[PDB]
Amino acid sequence: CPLMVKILDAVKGTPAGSVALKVSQKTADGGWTQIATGVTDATGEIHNLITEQQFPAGVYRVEFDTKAYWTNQGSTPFHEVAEVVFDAHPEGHRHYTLALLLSPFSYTTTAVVS
Amino acid sequence: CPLMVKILDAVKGTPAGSVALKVSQKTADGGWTQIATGVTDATGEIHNLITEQQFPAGVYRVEFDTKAYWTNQGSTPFHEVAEVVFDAHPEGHRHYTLALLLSPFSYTTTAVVS
Amino acid sequence: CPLMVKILDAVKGTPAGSVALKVSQKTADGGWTQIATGVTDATGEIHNLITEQQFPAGVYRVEFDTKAYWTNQGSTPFHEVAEVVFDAHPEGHRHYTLALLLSPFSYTTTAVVS
Amino acid sequence: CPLMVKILDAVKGTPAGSVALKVSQKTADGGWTQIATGVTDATGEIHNLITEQQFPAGVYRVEFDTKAYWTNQGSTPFHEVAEVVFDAHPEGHRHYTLALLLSPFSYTTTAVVS
Numbered sequence: 001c002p003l004m005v006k007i008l009d010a011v012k013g014t015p016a017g018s019v020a021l022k023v024s025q026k027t028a029d030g031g032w033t034q035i036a037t038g039v040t041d042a043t044g045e046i047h048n049l050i051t052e053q054q055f056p057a058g059v060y061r062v063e064f065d066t067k068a069y070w071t072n073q074g075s076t077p078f079h080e081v082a083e084v085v086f087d088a089h090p091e092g093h094r095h096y097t098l099a100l101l102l103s104p105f106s107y108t109t110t111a112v113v114s
Numbered sequence: 115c116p117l118m119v120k121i122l123d124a125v126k127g128t129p130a131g132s133v134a135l136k137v138s139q140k141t142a143d144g145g146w147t148q149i150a151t152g153v154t155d156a157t158g159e160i161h162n163l164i165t166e167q168q169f170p171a172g173v174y175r176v177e178f179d180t181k182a183y184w185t186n187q188g189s190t191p192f193h194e195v196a197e198v199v200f201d202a203h204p205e206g207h208r209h210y211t212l213a214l215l216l217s218p219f220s221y222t223t224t225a226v227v228s
Numbered sequence: 229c230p231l232m233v234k235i236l237d238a239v240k241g242t243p244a245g246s247v248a249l250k251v252s253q254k255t256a257d258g259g260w261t262q263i264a265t266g267v268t269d270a271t272g273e274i275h276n277l278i279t280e281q282q283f284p285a286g287v288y289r290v291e292f293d294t295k296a297y298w299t300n301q302g303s304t305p306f307h308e309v310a311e312v313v314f315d316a317h318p319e320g321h322r323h324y325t326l327a328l329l330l331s332p333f334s335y336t337t338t339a340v341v342s
Numbered sequence: 343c344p345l346m347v348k349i350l351d352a353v354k355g356t357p358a359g360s361v362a363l364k365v366s367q368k369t370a371d372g373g374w375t376q377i378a379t380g381v382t383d384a385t386g387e388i389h390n391l392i393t394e395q396q397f398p399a400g401v402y403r404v405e406f407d408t409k410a411y412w413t414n415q416g417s418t419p420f421h422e423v424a425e426v427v428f429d430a431h432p433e434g435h436r437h438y439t440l441a442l443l444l445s446p447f448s449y450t451t452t453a454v455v456s
């Protein structure tokens with residue numbers, strides 16, 4: 001799997017379970033094609049989110065539904081979503097991990113690329 | 115002015131000057147209308163980005179062109195853009211400051227709401 | 229004043245008021261001399277923390293009592309304290325601002341150096 | 343192993359290899375007892391850093407030598423070290439992971455506690 005996510009909760013000190021997200025690929029005319037969706041497990045991950053055939057070179061957007069996560073926790077969130085947009089160059093089985101650290105009014109995101 | 119930004123550079127310890135951004139409001143059908151553009155000054159700020167008349171409650175997006183910023187700093191960036199998407203509740207002259215801390219492969223964003 | 233702080237609360241989207249801190253300079257033998265204390269105001273700042281006369285070049289530590297802050301907010305914290313330790317090069321009226329973004333199990337710290 | 347670390351590099355988008363650190367336990371009179379040291383591998387980790395017998399309930403400090411890491415990379419760092427101080431309650435094989443995201447003038451740290 002060339003695309004992994006890891007989400008943590010900065011209020012409780014746990015991975016962020018049950019976060020919904022969607023992966024889209026940018027189209028020529030500027031639109032977006034949905035290619036996968038999922039919900040993180042209790043470790044804040046989605047295993048085998050997409051396949052290598054689904055992940056050609058191009059621009060991708062991963063949209064994380066952080067608002068619902070905080071609503072469930074009882075907190076009042078600021079953001080509607082966390083968005084991560086990047087150009088993928090997957091040749092050579094290059095792998096992408098998107099890490100995300102959530103607070104109700106803040107998030108930190110980083111990427112680890114092999 | 116109800117919407118401010120403050121952008122900092124985590125590599126060199128200075129505000130991020132000359133960062134372009136676009137502000138959009140979400141429409142009822144789920145699309146986006148651009149309502150303003152600007153470029154940060156050398157303090158990492160944009161004064162008078164929008165007016166209170168342009169800022170009813172709703173969903174807003176600020177798109178920061180961080181890729182062009184890192185290219186101009188001379189460091190290869192990961193993100194194609196940094197998008198901050200948030201719910202506005204201006205009732206009562208509430209002001210919003212979007213703070214953004216930039217590194218080539220990471221950013222932290224938070225908000226200060228008066 | 230050559231040393232400023234700005235503390236924000238990532239849970240509620242406001243400055244962190246009433247955060248106690250202690251400033252120390254490192255001695256030649258590797259110990260620490262306390263040179264100032266303060267408490268943040270409701271803007272998350274401490275004015276006139278030290279003077280230029282108290283700020284030669286060297287190694288400084290700012291110890292932020294974040295555990296007492298989170299206890300008073302009513303959220304269980306992870307860290308016993310947040311310590312920021314840095315090299316000062318004041319030659320030329322260089323000013324230092326320590327920015328600190330707090331969550332119960334995380335913090336982000338950066339600096340803006342004039 | 344009850345204590346793990348994970349260090350990432352926000353400039354290059356890789357784990358932070360070859361970072362030296364030391365683990366100390368707080369003493370009654372306020373001092374510190376060194377209990378382990380190590381250097382991260384290429385995945386930004388130190389496997390089996392300490393044993394459960396070495397990790398009684400108490401306050402611990404993990405000091406990461408970030409200055410040397412940035413000097414090696416050619417960057418000019420702000421901080422001397424990154425310090426993480428916390429009270430450990432290891433009963434029930436409770437585990438602690440200290441995560442750390444480094445930039446030359448900034449770091450984010452968080453903890454995951456099982």
Ligand SMILES: O=C(O)C(F)(F)C(F)(F)C(F)(F)C(F)(F)C(F)(F)C(F)(F)C(F)(F)F
Binds near residue numbers: 109349450451452
């Ligand atoms: O699970 C892991 O080992 C991990 F992916 F490396 C990570 F620990 F989650 C992490 F990416 F390092 C991290 F914790 F998320 C972080 F340090 F990057 C962070 F916390 F700062 C951020 F905010 F990015 F999530």
Ligand SMILES: O=C(O)C(F)(F)C(F)(F)C(F)(F)C(F)(F)C(F)(F)C(F)(F)C(F)(F)F
Binds near residue numbers: 120122234328329337
């Ligand atoms: O300039 C200011 O007064 C400010 F907006 F408060 C700020 F200092 F930039 C800040 F927001 F606090 C901050 F520095 F950006 C931060 F601390 F929040 C940060 F650095 F951690 C983050 F990464 F969020 F920008």
